[PDB]
């Protein structure tokens, strides 16, 4: 599996290992249990437009 196809299915960072991809996330996010998605830990995570009025 490769980061060059669909970013290894990672929401954010993808890195290749020998025979796999590993996903990771920016500060303020936690990698989901599925190992792919990045879940914000707060209401103003980095890099997200502020579109939901709180």
């Amino acid at each position: 599996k490769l980061c060059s196809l669909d970013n290894g299915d990672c929401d954010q960072f993808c890195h290749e290992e020998q025979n796999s991809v590993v996903c990771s996330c920016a500060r303020g996010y936690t990698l989901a249990d599925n190992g792919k998605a990045c879940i914000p830990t707060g209401p103003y995570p980095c890099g997200k437009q502020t579109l939901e009025r709180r």
């Binding site: 929401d11 960072f13 303020g28 103003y44 502020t50």
Partner: protein, 233 residues
């Protein structure tokens, strides 16, 4: 910003504005965290003293969500060179923390290798600011954004009267009349990846604005990701 469009509500929340001795914007910045702003080192020489405004979209309207923050520490790159604008990067630590809210949120710092393989290889990034709306024009009272294509380094160098170092990259258009401009410098160049925006550049310089055969020149943030992390402690 020449061309482009006004930033819609909530769409440019990482934009900061450096304001000189009179509450007037002269450069942009990017919010990195509650305490840190990213800007260009050259902006530090454009005003004796300055403060940082966040949350602003219209400089002639006190909307209510804006805040001004004083600067506690200036961290300039120790290799910044005024003649070439090489190493054109600085971080500001604020005296008081930003409260994230509508129109006020940080942009993400990417991991370097992934930024190089995945962000810098995108077709476009986005640049934003309150700068001039044409080369010899006035600053915009409204925050603008603009999608700018990445421009290959070879074409970048040939086009330029000035050296393009490996701490710089080109973005924008050959002849299409859209670019950043004076007053945008220091502000964000971000690249979208699955609805998350990552810092990829700092608006640095150009020869005029939106000139035929010239591009916008940006500080290459991937070269400085380790430097930024150290500067933020």
């Amino acid at each position: 910003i020449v061309g482009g469009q006004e930033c819609k509500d909530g769409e440019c929340p990482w934009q900061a504005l450096l304001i000189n001795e009179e509450n007037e914007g002269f450069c942009g910045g990017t919010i990195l965290s509650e305490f840190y702003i990213l800007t260009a080192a050259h902006c530090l020489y454009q005003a004796k003293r300055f403060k940082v405004r966040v949350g602003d979209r219209n400089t002639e309207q006190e909307e209510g969500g804006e805040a001004v923050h004083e600067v506690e520490v200036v961290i300039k790159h120790n290799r910044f060179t005024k003649e070439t604008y090489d190493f054109d990067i600085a971080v500001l630590r604020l005296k008081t923390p930003i409260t994230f809210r509508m129109n006020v949120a940080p942009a993400c710092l990417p991991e370097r290798d992934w930024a190089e393989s995945t962000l810098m290889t995108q077709k476009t990034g986005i640049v934003s600011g309150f700068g001039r709306t044409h080369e010899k024009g006035e600053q915009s009272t409204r925050l603008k954004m603009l999608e700018v294509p990445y421009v290959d380094r070879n074409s970048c160098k040939l086009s330029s009267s000035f050296i393009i170092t490996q701490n710089m990259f080109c973005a924008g258009y050959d002849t299409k009349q859209e670019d950043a401009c004076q007053g945008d410098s220091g502000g964000p160049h971000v690249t979208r990846f699955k609805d998350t925006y990552f810092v990829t550049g700092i608006v640095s310089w150009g020869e005029g604005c939106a000139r035929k055969g010239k591009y916008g020149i940006y500080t290459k943030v991937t070269a400085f990701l380790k430097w930024i992390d150290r500067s933020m402690k």
